């Protein structure tokens, strides 16, 4: 209930400030800027998406690497160490593949 209370209070405070910043300040009359948004009419470059998919996959591998602190308490330390090093080596291998091949163009 405490954490829920913190979330509620923070959200309500932020929303109240947004109210007093979006609707309260616009009450003051400032004439009227009869100025139309003159619009008269697409850079979908892979340069952006590539940065996104690669991040998704590396974030996935990072997710597998999260339980490591508790995994150090296992009696089978050798096996756990080997598996952790394996996951890290695979992360490095994925990075190397992209770097060696046509990747990391960002």
């Amino acid at each position: 209930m405490n954490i829920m209370l913190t979330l509620l209070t923070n959200v309500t405070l932020a929303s109240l400030l947004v109210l007093i910043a979006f609707w309260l300040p616009q009450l003051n009359a400032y004439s009227e800027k009869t100025s139309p948004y003159e619009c008269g009419f697409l850079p979908f470059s892979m340069k952006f998406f590539l940065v996104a998919i690669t991040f998704l996959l590396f974030d996935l591998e990072i997710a597998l690497l999260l339980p490591l602190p508790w995994a150090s308490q296992t009696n089978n330390l050798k096996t756990m160490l080997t598996m952790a090093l394996f996951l890290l080596i695979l992360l490095a291998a994925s990075l190397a593949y992209e770097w060696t091949q046509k990747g990391l163009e960002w």
Binding site: F44, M46, I53, L56, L57, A63, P67
Partner: protein
Amino acid sequence: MPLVYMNIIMAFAIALAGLLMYRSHLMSSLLCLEGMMLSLFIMSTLIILNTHFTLANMMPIILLVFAACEAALGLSLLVMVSNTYGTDYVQNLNLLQC
């Protein structure tokens, strides 16, 4: 089954229905597919926790990883299709018939 399990299963059903009933954007279909993965994560997590299936607490994480991999695949296909056609509309995928 507890009502929470019913609600999660119903969520999976709703997401499946939305996925199968496309509207225009293939992006919306991918969103429905990933939602289903989320619902499966929640269901499996609750089941494992309640059963105290300690050794099977890793199943949801593996499901999540593979889920996001297949999504990375879907997005990559969507951008290829959009770059070719101009939009991600499902109607654009019409060259192959029958």
